[PDB]
């Protein structure tokens, strides 16, 4: 296994950790704030996923400072992970095209 496929795997594992920790911390941050909906773990996890994927339906979102800071970490982890996968795919294709051209 080369570097790019290693970093991609690591980013995927790390993303899973961020989703789980993010769901836990979001509930912890949002409870205590009147009107907050991000307050139970199952839907918090669903919120984490759609935050990391950038979909953001808007059915759930943080209203507190720390809940929003947690969200930012989830967003960045998502953008970085999927960005790291795209870069890895590009490296794979560049290398294969390099061999195909006999260089």
């Amino acid at each position, epitope marked *: 296994s080369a570097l790019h496929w290693r970093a991609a795997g690591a980013a995927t594992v790390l993303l899973v950790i961020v989703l789980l920790a993010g769901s836990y911390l979001a509930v*912890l941050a949002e*409870r205590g704030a009147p009107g907050a909906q991000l*307050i*139970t773990y199952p839907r918090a996890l669903w919120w984490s996923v759609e935050t990391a994927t950038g979909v953001g339906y808007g059915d759930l979102y943080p209203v507190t400072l720390w809940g929003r800071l947690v969200a930012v970490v989830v967003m960045v982890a998502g953008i970085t992970s999927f960005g790291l996968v795209t870069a890895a795919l590009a490296t794979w294709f560049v290398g294969r095209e390099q061999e195909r051209r006999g260089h």
Partner: antibody
Framework: QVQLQQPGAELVKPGASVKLSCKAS????????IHWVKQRPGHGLEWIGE????????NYNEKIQKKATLTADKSSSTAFMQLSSLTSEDSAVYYC???????????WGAGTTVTVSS | DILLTQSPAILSVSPGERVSFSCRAS??????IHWYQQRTNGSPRLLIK???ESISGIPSRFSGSGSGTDFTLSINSVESEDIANYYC?????????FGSGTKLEIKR
């Protein structure tokens, strides 16, 4: 086995303070919240506050005067509620309940009847 | 905060008859409502979670329905042990809140 164990009763003098206990058993998770509910005779259920033992953070009902302070001990799996400066208005049954972080109170304690009197 | 209205406060029914408790939320809360039973001198007891999901150990005659703002707890053929107070509770928005409660009476 009884998941939540509370003392039967507590007698408190007007102005004094009392710490109610709630010893938990059964399955315990990091996502567990312990809630406290106040019920006056003839009246309904009134939410007081919550605490997450795995982190120690507590939240309280903003609609009522804060006379409670929630703490927890992970070593003995026991939740505590510190009621301070009590009047006859504070005389009620105080239940503790366990929520698995999914919104509902799966199990309740037997309740601690608190009487404020001289 | 979310207000839960339970009306009527008292429901009189004949034995074996179907009864329905109503719970109305001050705003839309999907299906995040839960039902509890409290008999005389007893502690509350979970009957239905998430509006309609049954609980292990609870008789099949207990059921729930509704979504949004209007929720209903139903009892098929009320018997004597069903005499109690019935509370609804929401978990959609912080803080959790309880309804005022409905008492069930049996006309024997």
């Amino acid at each position: 086995q009884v998941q939540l164990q509370q003392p039967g009763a507590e007698l408190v003098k007007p102005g004094a303070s009392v710490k109610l206990s709630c010893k938990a058993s059964g399955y315990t998770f990091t996502s567990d919240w312990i809630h406290w509910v106040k019920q006056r005779p003839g009246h309904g259920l009134e939410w007081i506050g919550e605490i997450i033992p795995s982190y120690g953070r507590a939240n309280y009902n903003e609609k009522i005067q804060k006379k409670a302070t929630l703490t927890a001990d992970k070593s003995s799996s026991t939740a505590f509620m510190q009621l301070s400066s009590l009047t006859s208005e504070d005389s009620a049954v105080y239940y503790c309940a366990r929520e698995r972080g999914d919104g509902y109170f799966a199990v309740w304690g037997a309740g601690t009847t608190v009487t404020v009197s001289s | 905060d979310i207000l839960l209205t339970q009306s009527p406060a008292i429901l009189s029914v004949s034995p074996g008859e179907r009864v329905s408790f109503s719970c109305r939320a001050s705003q839309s809360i999907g299906t995040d409502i839960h039902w509890y039973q409290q008999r005389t001198n007893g502690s509350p007891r979970l009957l239905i979670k998430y509006a309609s999901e049954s609980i292990s150990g609870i008789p099949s005659r207990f059921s729930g329905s509704g979504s949004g703002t209007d929720f209903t707890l139903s009892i098929n053929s009320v018997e004597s042990e069903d005499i109690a107070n019935y509370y609804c509770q929401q978990s959609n928005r912080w803080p959790f809140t309880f309804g005022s409660g409905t008492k069930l009476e049996i006309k024997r």
